[PDB]
Amino acid sequence: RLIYTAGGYFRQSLSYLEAYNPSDGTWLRLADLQVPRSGLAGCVVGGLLYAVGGRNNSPDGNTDSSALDCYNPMTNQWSPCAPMSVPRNRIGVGVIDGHIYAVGGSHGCIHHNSVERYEPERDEWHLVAPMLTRRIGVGVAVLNRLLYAVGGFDGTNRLNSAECYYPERNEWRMITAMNTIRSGAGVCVLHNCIYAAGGYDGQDQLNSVERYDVATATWTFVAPMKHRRSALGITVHQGRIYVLGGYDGHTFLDSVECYDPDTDTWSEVTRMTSGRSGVGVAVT
Template identity: 60%
Template sequence: MELAKKANQYIERRFMQICQEEEFLQLSANQLIHLIRKDELNVQDEKEVYNAVLKWVKYDEDNRNHKMENILAAVRLQFLTPKFINEQIQKCDVIKKTPACKEYLAKIFKDLTLHVRTAVKERTPNIPRVIYVAGGYYKQSLDILEGFNIDDKTWIKLDRLIVPRSGLGCAFLKGHFYAVGGRNNSPGNSYDSDWVDRYNPILDEWMPCHPMSCPRNRVGVAVMDGLLYAVGGGECSKYHKSVECYDPEMDNWTLVKPMHYPRLAVGVAVVNRILYAIGGFDGSTRHSSAECYHPENNEWTMISSMKTERSGAGVCAMDKYIYVVGGYDGRQLNTVERYDTENEMWEFVAPMKLSRSALSVTVLDGRIYAMGGYDGQRFLRDVEIYDPITDSWMDGTPLTSGRSGHASAVCYNCYTQERNLAMDTDSIMNPSEQPSTSGFR
């Protein structure tokens, strides 16, 4: 049984390598379905699973095409983009030859574009996950990158940012950790940044990407449909309502429809393929207002306002809720409110123990991690963890040093994965032995 467990883990963690082997193409339809149904399958994008299925069918298309319908039901198509699904409907010969598959894809496409909430869960690869925290401010902008290992609850220092920055936004996309915008506030060298850098967790190194259309300090950053969105922010005394999105495959940025209001230190999150921009500061007013962006029609729509105006809050999404944590309304806040995206209502939940603005929040294992920030007197290293089931906060492992204006995201620790997975591959294919925002205030 121990060998079977190791074999399963090997297959789950190295699915993309396994797909290149002849043995993968020799799997029966039932064996393939058993494999791709696994929650723990380690893929960066569900497109990888879909393409593996197509490869398997095309290996013996005459005898396998009729099996495609049952196999396709095991692919988590709900996490593909509408653009990709539409391309498959229009261009994929295998799909076009199977009317039932075409109808199924058309239904998924419709649900995605109508933002229908799915009961299908995202995959949870059985590899270490790490909370990465980048940049920040303490006396000057910082070039820190560190990772929190959830298993042993320790912080480790990683390759430093290319330039120090605070007020940046970060996100994890297709195997890389992105640092976007911010400000280099250093002695004799202070400027707002249009820089975008990409960190490779396997190589522990940074590479520059194409810059944004303009500098964006205290920017909101989120991922939707495989694209990286940079929302609002500011440059010197200019406050942006502009929004742009980055395509990592093309390495370019495209401006989309601007928001209704300029928003510095805005919080952003995505639920059901809708991008939400919440709070912020426009140079004269601190906002309680919020708006959402629909990619289908490239339009922003105002939604219900928060109960409290705030900028520099930590914002994240979990299930159907968007949580807004702390921030600043003339004083640092410990209050937390959440928006029910289905019922379109705001409600307060349990407050943090500490008041703080310019913190960073992220979600891991159904809990919210609120890290660092500024309480009006101190730059905090304190971490608090929110459990929505008990509606309570508990203390977490502190950051290595106090800071504000940093950003964070949860990443798969690919380096640890590769290092820890040395094992014999003989008979491994036998299925019987068997997947933020930041600101200063």
Template identity: 45%
Template structure:
């Protein structure tokens, strides 16, 4: 199965992403590397973004190819070496379909079960070998539903709903819990945070954010949850805060250099990276990294293209098993 255009016609990938080597002994020590992938996005003018990969060994983003289906405001997460694009909006309607990108062969596959209902503005995360699709908007209403994907049986099933309806929320996994952070209830941005216990199948309230945020970036870094950017009642935000589970409190962190709503936040190779977003005027391609030691944000280059409403995720791979010379160059 190859990459598909919107007409569902098969398009052969121009080049494989990875070259797996077999000549190394099993006992050889390897150094893990996390590749960062920016997936899709659809601008108001109809321009569609493809797939980009950040190679930390060369500090360079490279365009790998087109997306399988046009998606904006989809959930993006990695599971078992594949990247999943969940739900979203194709410019006309909300989507229930789910696809996975097999990075080993640089192909999209449509062998994943669909969600129970179309949704956009969802958040997706991996926990315990499952994918969780949290909240969203079904085209009419903001929802509080949560679905869990089991890759062994290729099936989504509903679990306990959140206490609040949320779209444009952030999700993060910490200490075996799934946190739902901020978002909007369809009327206004939210301060509230809640966490899901997969053992008890129950959501419980947590300490609220210091600032209400929707379309924020959210990730776990060094044992704490970071909530960055987004939008409040008035404007796009550059402010950042983090949650410490030991104190059960959110505290302020130095702001990013740019305002970023619809920002993607990811952790890769020891960095907390804020990728893209909307600054109130344009969708940006800049990337910022949080320097833990200096407690400050710094510039970290640019993606090749903008990804409005796209998603970012990281996948860890052994550097000894990769031949980066076979990644397609774009500059």
């Protein structure tokens, strides 16, 4: 399996689809997105890769996206799907029981607390319960059939708060806040923890990384990344965490770092073909 990265931004929103591989360290160029997009999220359901939300920030516009598009690795074709109820730039997404959850994001000045849910078999969206908090740049992960919305930006305050969605019950509950305020962090699940890597705290991009232990309801720091970054892509591959690109306050990163939990160390694994922020990432 490979690490797919879709979209992103460098001087303008990008159409790139590229696939990386632990084993041989090779970068592969695949079919372009049909509409450029940055600030999207990526996820895999079935064996199909989905690009959700974002915006097309171009020399001729800056259009927030409600689009859902689906990539089949078997066919190398992007296929459009039904669109979300609203555009969601800087969206977060998680997958529960083959359903895609779209969390927060912005449309113009509107910072969403709304959440909606997609079913690939029926190709259609519905509104579920909204978060307690408006959040863009929100990190989202799924642990034991529960969905977590972590950090982000409400329009004025960047957030260290996190809340959890109970699908059986359609209720959001606040949990213990992170030690660090983080918007545009990379958020994933590795083993039985929710990791939050990097982000922006309103003053600095961060290299720190913390993880939430659901049993103890406690956030604890782990080893920091080499390079501070926000708006990074992140995914789990072979029980290791990869972070891809991002922005550090001046430079668009091509750096890719890899976290090994057994050794608690980050190692620079590769570089993307070009630096960019705001990608969507997933593995299949």
